[PDB]
Design a protein around this ligand. Structure first.
Ligand SMILES: *CC(=O)CNC(=O)CCCC[C@H]1SC[C@@H]2NC(=O)N[C@@H]21
Ligand SMILES: *CC(=O)CNC(=O)CCCC[C@H]1SC[C@@H]2NC(=O)N[C@@H]21
Ligand SMILES: *CC(=O)CNC(=O)CCCC[C@H]1SC[C@@H]2NC(=O)N[C@@H]21
Ligand SMILES: *CC(=O)CNC(=O)CCCC[C@H]1SC[C@@H]2NC(=O)N[C@@H]21
Ligand SMILES: *CC(=O)CNC(=O)CCCC[C@H]1SC[C@@H]2NC(=O)N[C@@H]21
Ligand SMILES: [K+]
Ligand SMILES: [K+]
Ligand SMILES: [K+]
Ligand SMILES: [K+]
Ligand SMILES: [K+]
Ligand SMILES: [K+]
Ligand SMILES: [K+]
Ligand SMILES: [K+]
Ligand SMILES: [K+]
Lengths: 352, 345, 363, 374, 349
């Protein structure tokens, strides 16, 4: 087994539990932004994923119907979904739309919701209907249907609510936090687009085509180490379907110089080409969005990152995993950080 | 019946025949680009659609695979594929890659090609393979195979060739035309996005997600008339499915009758409810009048010349107002006032 | 445990490794033809399976398309595919067409290749196309595509090559053998055809419909023991998906009844130690073939005879699964198991007993 | 302005039969041919039972599908070789002993429900998940009993003995009394994916028995048709009939579209948009395309010539303009312009024939020798 | 040891039977029940042929699938009502005149191949595109001949006449010699999507005959169990057993989330939700024939199953009264097993 010492942490909020839903993109976004609110000085916040999970789905439904089934309709999503939704739909406190409130529960189970809405969206998007029906205001009946089924399972979005004495709209509540989409940028590292460029990652949950900035794998890993040591958290989207990623709370990248996962061992540090290949050949897919809040060493001096997951606190380190550098550099798909976490030099190469 | 008289037309090249493939996007784009080369004094070109179709399908296959099948793999394309293609792949003359050359024909029939390539792309993009194979230089084998099958049915793309006594590459040939993708804007008119912004049209053949400037409908149609009256032609993407231009070479809303002039909401309705779909690409190159004063855009099609007007036909202004999905024009074809509200230099 | 003593074995070449492809039919065929070349005093050969696997698949694709999908398109095959191929396509040394060279590997993994080529062949053979395309010389476009894809994953087969100071074509390299397909006969033992006649085994991988001579099962086993005691090896096709065939190197047909006669009324060691064996009648063997218990013609090579502690007789088999097994790629198949589960064998004509040869009309 | 035919020479045939709603042409054409053969050999008029042979053939085809795990398709078709092998293996019985339709109050076959049931039964065995098929204490397969029982329910119980014109027979002894011999008959084809003057099994689905055909150059292959007819023999004729030239009105022609378009008035561009009724391509005598060995090969290779239909060629005729046709006895009843007879132009036969069976003595002597047929 | 049981009161059962590889629990449990009824009525021990009844019921179930164009599923299951209707309609035969496995050289059922063919045959008629099924000159349907002939090939020829303990019978006259009457048995259930003291057909796929059950409030429903056992009757017991764990130790018990543990005692509504939300399905048929207690005094119904005797209690096992109350779907008892007052509340004379 492993024993880990913390080298450096930055404040996070409590550990949340997405339970039975592919909502990691939203719980990790909010985990990341809550940490940002703490460091900006706004106090502790608990935002409602269910509210923008709800709204993102209706748009995605619309996108699947426009593209006649090309845009897959599924539970997942992106960091960009949250940043966009925040400026578009607003934000509400968790208290106004909690997981599981409609089926006598306290945590999400979205399996039946998906069974119904997947079939509905597919009956429109991939069926044989030649002319979809609308009302006298040209509003579509199938979107009423889809939105109504989502509210039956997720709750009805508040149009107005009271929070800590003052009443809000989701927009004005969003303005109360003082977050701006522009402050944060998405970064990645691949060779099938030129470096220091903008491209939308070619993954199904990026159906909105959110753009990402493209660094070489060594500058890319310098923003991670810089962001931590200057006091920032990172929204970390990565591939966690790996023999190295454990349910015992550790994500390593063992070598063949060696019980590869159970005890500390030499790490395999990847070139840029070995890494691009894994994304081209399906060994690296957009599995999971989490939050990395700092740095640590194990009992042999090997270096790891402190990640906060969205699976509750029933695990070896109460819902926290340790992700090794060799793992984070091989299998990261994108990270969203705030601009001020970039080094000056890295920021400079094509960056305001 | 209809009797038309031309009001104004700008030069076009000859009518081509796409035959049996859904390559209208490329054929119309090249009719539009060739007209542009005439406008700019560069003379008459016949560009190879097959060459651009070839390279576009390879990128579409890679998009299908990367998105695990979400990007459909089909014969279709957009005006942006041709514009992106020329800057990315270059151009070659017609005779360097002709339709039908590999199966003893002179016109396209891509049904077998699609049947084989559709099955290969899906076996990768929607199968169960978890580690796709690569050579010792990290080049993917499935890409080699999809390209190899495309070459067997469409031809080996030239790396160099001689054209009117001068040697080129596809890149240096394109450079010799002086065309710039930066000169062309895409325009559309819808209410599910704000006017005077850019969004990418939500249609399966825009898998590259090329942006269009969104204009209110009355100004959208001002661009049509202004482009034609000042010497430009128009790359024209529209739903022709229900139009009945198959019967007489005319599209209306068989005698001249008053056209229902659509509002912005009725036209947004048809797009939202699937009545306006299957974006077909052609070229608008003039304005004509029927014997009762009604107004039509003259359309160059890519279905050959065995039709009532020898491959051209007429689309009433109203029809074009209702069923257009996007157009591509030179920047200089936009009126000064409209151009300024979009930030276009 | 098991302890084995060799009674008589005949030289084989080294144990090869087919890895992740259903190409046992070709590796076993070549294990047998290389043992043949050794026994004709021609030296140790390593013929290229990939060259023959490549050409076999193009024929098999053509058979699928001509029959509109009835001939299944898959990775398997038969000994006849190899003897047909040696005389139709030629032969090349291993070095000219290696497993895995196209995808930075040293052993085969044909899963992605099959993924692609199964889908292409099915798009033609089971699709709705009414007029396949062809070029100015009437050569079919689909065939070219299929061939180009096989080349990308397996290799470009050589037109000419140099081997030990001499240069060859695959054809001329095969004439360099002295091997003649007419020298080898296929034998089986079933009762849905009369004995001493020829019929094509009704199995999917016999899509060329190679004939086999049908023997009574007792004379069928005589051929085994004579072939081998007289110096020959056997190309051995049988079903190995049985309780008795194990990954621990043993293939037994144990009589579960006479085992459970010793010390119990059981509710344990039926394959991990010498045991009594069921000796099948011609009828029980027919039943398992009729009822799907004997299937999946897996190909291997028999080269030796051995006994265990209690004198039971076993055939020594050379597998094509590598050398990380209990006996470094060698299995032991009891004579009872072979008699029950064999689908067909190929031997040289002169390995037959004289009366068996005369009864089958073999010159 | 249609077709008017005059017979040049035809040889005796029995009456036109009607296979109706079943894919049994192979056995109907085979028995049209064998009945002409018995007439030719002086044995008189027979009406052999197709249903008997269809019944036993499908049981063999079911077994083939099961042994090959569904590779051998199970469907209604068949081959000439099915019937020749059949007469020597199962025997023959007279029509009266197993009539079409008799089990479902009908006089003509409708095998749609029989196929619906037995295709589904055969596929449940051959392509399903069963790992050990069941057997009784004599090792007979239960699935074969079930498939036999359902075939008997829709087609009838085959006789083991019957009386015919005062004499009791079994199927085998009735076959023996006709004096037919399968070894008297040869199958011939003409393709180039195998060398000439060899035998190979045509690679088509209904040849699941892999019956062989002798391969001839196209011109020699056509000489056989003529020599057979002109010396008193008839021809079992396996052909593609899915062509615009093969019509419901008793004609099979192979027009040269270019030529007809040049005889006509309109140029190429107008003609492409002319009316099919105005083209008159299949309704009057027209110049024929006369294919090469290679064009014939390409159509087989490329799916334009498929194994569609078995019939009997028994004569040679001319139309009012002197063009030549083979006379074809079909098996679809007599409600058609020529009472169930088709006239197939020589061009059509040369281009779309898949294989033929004739008695060995129908072969021209020099061709017989090239084939090694003694 | 975990569970140690003491019998409080059990009623005579015949030997434990083995349905082996077929979903014929409905018929084996029906006959366990009816054989106990025969013992109770003083007629002695019988061994009735499930295969005879299974054969005739599938031919009816195939007809029901064909008439509803595939809505009635065709599968191996069935109901107690199938057996009660069957005995009045087809008769009964002794086990020896139609044994499991006899046609394929076994002694136990394996109906996998039989289903593979007959499922495919029934679907080809009921779900295909045939517009006019074929009939003979007497208007008997050929597809029914086909399906009948295939069932006989795998299950045997049903006897028309046979001799048993020295007397010759037909299936009907053997049934009459037992003295059993379908009218003597009532079907009971407990749900709230229909009113209490009414009859309705349970909405489960194996009740394609739409046999009616009387609906009782849960407490009165359990009172019938105890009354039947304590006055000497047994119970045809249909319930969900899927997630119960009886396989491991012979014991079905109610999870509060090996050893006797506290049992959640469900309400009518808790029991209703599980039938509405799919937690209670796969009605499995067995026989309850006694009452037992464990070492700590908790009470169980004794269950006779039909899977042979290679289990911890030799084919018998124990269900807590709480499990039985939560997971039972329907029961059949003789009318005289009902308390007088429940009898009156349902109008049963
Ligand atoms: C990025 C994500 O949210 C996916 N990561 C997760 O941890 C969620 C997956 C857990 C598996 C659950 S969700 C869907 C499925 N249905 C169910 O009842 N359990 C499964
Ligand atoms: C915008 C497009 O290209 C679709 N428009 C067309 O005009 C395509 C027309 C050719 C029709 C061909 S395509 C595939 C199909 N297969 C065939 O043999 N004819 C059809
Ligand atoms: C006669 C044969 O070759 C049958 N197969 C073997 O002997 C062992 C190799 C099969 C294992 C491979 S085949 C295709 C499949 N795909 C994969 O990755 N492993 C499997
Ligand atoms: C060689 C053949 O027998 C091909 N078929 C024919 O020549 C005539 C058959 C007409 C098509 C019938 S068969 C079965 C199907 N069911 C129906 O009602 N009509 C179809
Ligand atoms: C109410 C029932 O009969 C379901 N209960 C059972 O005990 C049936 C389970 C036996 C398992 C057999 S039956 C069908 C399936 N096919 C097979 O070969 N084993 C399975
Ligand atoms: K939260
Ligand atoms: K992975
Ligand atoms: K062109
Ligand atoms: K080798
Ligand atoms: K087996
Ligand atoms: K007849
Ligand atoms: K045809
Ligand atoms: K019984
Ligand atoms: K349950």
């Amino acid at each position: 087994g492993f024993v880990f010492t913390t080298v450096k942490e930055n404040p996070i909020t409590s550990v949340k539990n997405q339970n039975r839903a592919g909502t990691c993109w939203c719980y990790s976004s909010y985990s990341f932004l809550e940490s940002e609110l703490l460091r900006m000085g706004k106090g502790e916040y608990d935002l409602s994923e269910m509210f923008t999970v709800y709204n993102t789905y209706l748009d995605r439904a619309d996108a699947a119907v426009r593209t006649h089934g090309d845009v897959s309709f599924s539970q997942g999503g992106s960091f960009y979904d949250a940043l966009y939704g925040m400026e578009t739909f607003g934000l509400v406190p968790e208290e106004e739309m909690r997981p599981g409130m409609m089926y006598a529960d306290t945590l999400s189970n979205h399996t039946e919701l998906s069974a119904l809405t997947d079939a509905m969206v597919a009956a429109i998007a991939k069926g044989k209907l030649r002319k979809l029906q609308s009302d006298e205001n040209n509003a579509m009946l199938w979107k009423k249907a889809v939105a109504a089924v989502h509210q039956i399972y997720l709750g009805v979005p508040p149009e107005k609510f009271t929070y800590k004495g003052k009443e809000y709209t989701p927009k004005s509540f969003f303005e109360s936090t003082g977050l701006k989409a522009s402050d944060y940028v998405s970064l990645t590292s691949y060779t099938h687009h030129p470096f220091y460029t903008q491209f939308p990652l070619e993954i199904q949950d990026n159906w909105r085509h959110g753009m990402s900035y493209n660094l070489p794998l060594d500058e890319f890993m310098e923003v991670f180490d810089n962001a931590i040591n200057t006091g920032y958290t990172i929204a970390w989207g990565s591939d966690v379907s790996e023999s190295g990623f454990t349910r015992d709370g550790v994500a390593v990248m063992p070598d063949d110089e060696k019980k590869l996962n159970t005890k500390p061992q030499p790490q395999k540090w990847c070139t840029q080409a070995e890494r691009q290949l894994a994304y081209d050949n399906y060994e690296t897919t957009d599995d999971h969005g989490m939050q990395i809040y700092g740095i640590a060493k194990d009992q042999e001096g090997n270096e790891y990152y402190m990640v906060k997951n969205s699976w509750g606190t029933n695990s070896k380190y109460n819902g926290i995993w340790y992700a090794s550098k060799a793992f984070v550099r091989y299998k990261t798909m994108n990270i969203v950080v705030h601009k001020d976490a970039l080094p000056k030099a890295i920021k400079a190469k094509l960056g305001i």
